[PDB]
Amino acid sequence: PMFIVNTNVPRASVPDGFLSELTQQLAQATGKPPQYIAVHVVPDQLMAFGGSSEPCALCSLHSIGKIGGAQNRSYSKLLCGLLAERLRISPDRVYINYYDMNAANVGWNNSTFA
Amino acid sequence: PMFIVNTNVPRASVPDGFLSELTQQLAQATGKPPQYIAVHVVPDQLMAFGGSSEPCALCSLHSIGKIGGAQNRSYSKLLCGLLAERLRISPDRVYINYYDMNAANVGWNNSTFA
Amino acid sequence: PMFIVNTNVPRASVPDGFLSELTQQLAQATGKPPQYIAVHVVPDQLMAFGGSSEPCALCSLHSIGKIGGAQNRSYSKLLCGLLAERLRISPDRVYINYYDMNAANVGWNNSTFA
Numbered sequence: 001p002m003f004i005v006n007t008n009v010p011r012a013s014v015p016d017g018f019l020s021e022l023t024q025q026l027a028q029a030t031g032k033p034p035q036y037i038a039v040h041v042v043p044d045q046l047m048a049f050g051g052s053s054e055p056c057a058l059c060s061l062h063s064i065g066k067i068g069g070a071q072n073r074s075y076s077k078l079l080c081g082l083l084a085e086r087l088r089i090s091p092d093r094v095y096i097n098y099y100d101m102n103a104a105n106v107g108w109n110n111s112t113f114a
Numbered sequence: 115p116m117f118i119v120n121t122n123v124p125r126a127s128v129p130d131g132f133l134s135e136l137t138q139q140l141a142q143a144t145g146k147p148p149q150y151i152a153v154h155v156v157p158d159q160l161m162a163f164g165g166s167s168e169p170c171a172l173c174s175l176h177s178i179g180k181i182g183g184a185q186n187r188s189y190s191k192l193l194c195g196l197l198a199e200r201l202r203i204s205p206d207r208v209y210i211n212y213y214d215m216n217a218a219n220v221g222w223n224n225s226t227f228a
Numbered sequence: 229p230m231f232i233v234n235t236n237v238p239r240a241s242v243p244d245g246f247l248s249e250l251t252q253q254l255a256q257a258t259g260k261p262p263q264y265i266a267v268h269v270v271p272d273q274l275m276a277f278g279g280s281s282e283p284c285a286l287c288s289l290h291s292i293g294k295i296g297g298a299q300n301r302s303y304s305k306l307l308c309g310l311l312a313e314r315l316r317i318s319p320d321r322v323y324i325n326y327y328d329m330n331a332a333n334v335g336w337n338n339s340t341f342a
């Protein structure tokens with residue numbers, strides 16, 4: 001899977017080990033091996049949410065399976081909690097788009113997973 | 115909804131109020147509440163369009179509904195107009211990808227919209 | 229089509245002509261005219277792959293058609309080869325998400341391709 005967070009929070013406010021916490025927490029939540037989890041954090045962005053430049057985040061989670069109604073509700077609670085605790089972003093200023101990818105549409109290591 | 119613009123135009127060339135202008139114009143175009151509209155502008159990017167590094171933009175609009183044949187033509191006219199007037203980018207050097215998101219696949223405020 | 233690479237490799241390690249090289253190789257691989265190929269390279273990113281931050285890349289290819297099982301395997305070999313030879317990124321630390329876009333969902337030049 002891949003998880004991306006784009007935020008206006010400054011780089012200095014991203015705590016050490018944040019990529020590792022995302023990796024481990026997502027491995028547990030999705031059930032996928034940590035070796036297959038990629039994470040990408042983009043601070044200092046020029047962004048607004050509801051017209052306001054207070055701290056916010058736009059995120060995405062792509063996974064081959066492990067995406068659905070109940071699972072995405074659980075992911076949102078986990079990820080909003082982490083963004084609130086670690087980046088001080090209010091959950092009502094976070095979007096997370098979820099993508100259930102077909103294996104044939106995910107390339108890796110000179111091929112695709114299909 | 116969420117609107118992202120990636121561009122090679124430098125940050126100093128993005129005028130004041132551009133995030134607000136995008137927020138207001140997208141609220142009217144999509145009909146969605148301004149409170150739910152998120153905007154993200156990424157200048158100074160290493161990009162080419164048609165092999166050329168002249169000013170260009172790659173954009174995306176994600177929305178729960180309000181995406182379709184006619185609506186997307188109207189959004190493209192509005193958004194290319196703004197990128198031309200405000201960033202001086204020619205409309206034939208802009209792509210905008212449109213995504214009609216299922217409510218179950220959009221997280222916000224510790225939950226999803228499903 | 230549009231190809232985006234996000235990588236932790238620093239900007240100074242992105243060789244001259246890399247955007248043109250991607251444009252040319254993608255024009256041939258997708259069969260599309262190079263005038264329609266857009267490329268975007270984002271170096272210096274805060275990323276981890278499988279828990280570590282050795283060089284890695286998260287990429288996407290969006291195209292109206294020319295996406296499928298066999299084609300995506302071919303694109304992955306081409307693109308991982310280029311990331312390995314030019315950016316020194318191991319193919320097993322690259323993900324590429326493929327998107328077959330409907331023409332009605334791609335805006336360009338004040339309209340869409342539909």
Ligand SMILES: C[C@@H](N)[C@H](O)c1cccc(O)c1
Nearest residue numbers: 292293294329330331341342
């Ligand atoms: C069905 C769709 N892939 C198609 O035939 C096409 C090809 C080239 C450009 C287009 O806008 C659309």
Ligand SMILES: C[C@H](N)[C@H](O)c1cccc(O)c1
Nearest residue numbers: 064065066101102103113114
């Ligand atoms: C159907 C679903 N995509 C599936 O069963 C799968 C699981 C794990 C890896 C993978 O590539 C594919």
Ligand SMILES: [Cl-]
Nearest residue numbers: 016017018019
């Ligand atoms: Cl970190």
Ligand SMILES: [Cl-]
Nearest residue numbers: 068069070071
């Ligand atoms: Cl589910």
Ligand SMILES: [Cl-]
Nearest residue numbers: 100101102105
């Ligand atoms: Cl898919």
Ligand SMILES: [Cl-]
Nearest residue numbers: 115176177178
């Ligand atoms: Cl929406």
Ligand SMILES: [Cl-]
Nearest residue numbers: 183184187188
């Ligand atoms: Cl129309």
Ligand SMILES: [Cl-]
Nearest residue numbers: 214215216219
């Ligand atoms: Cl969806």
Ligand SMILES: [Cl-]
Nearest residue numbers: 279280281282
């Ligand atoms: Cl590391």
Ligand SMILES: [Cl-]
Nearest residue numbers: 296297298299
């Ligand atoms: Cl195919």
Ligand SMILES: [Cl-]
Nearest residue numbers: 328329330333
């Ligand atoms: Cl589509």
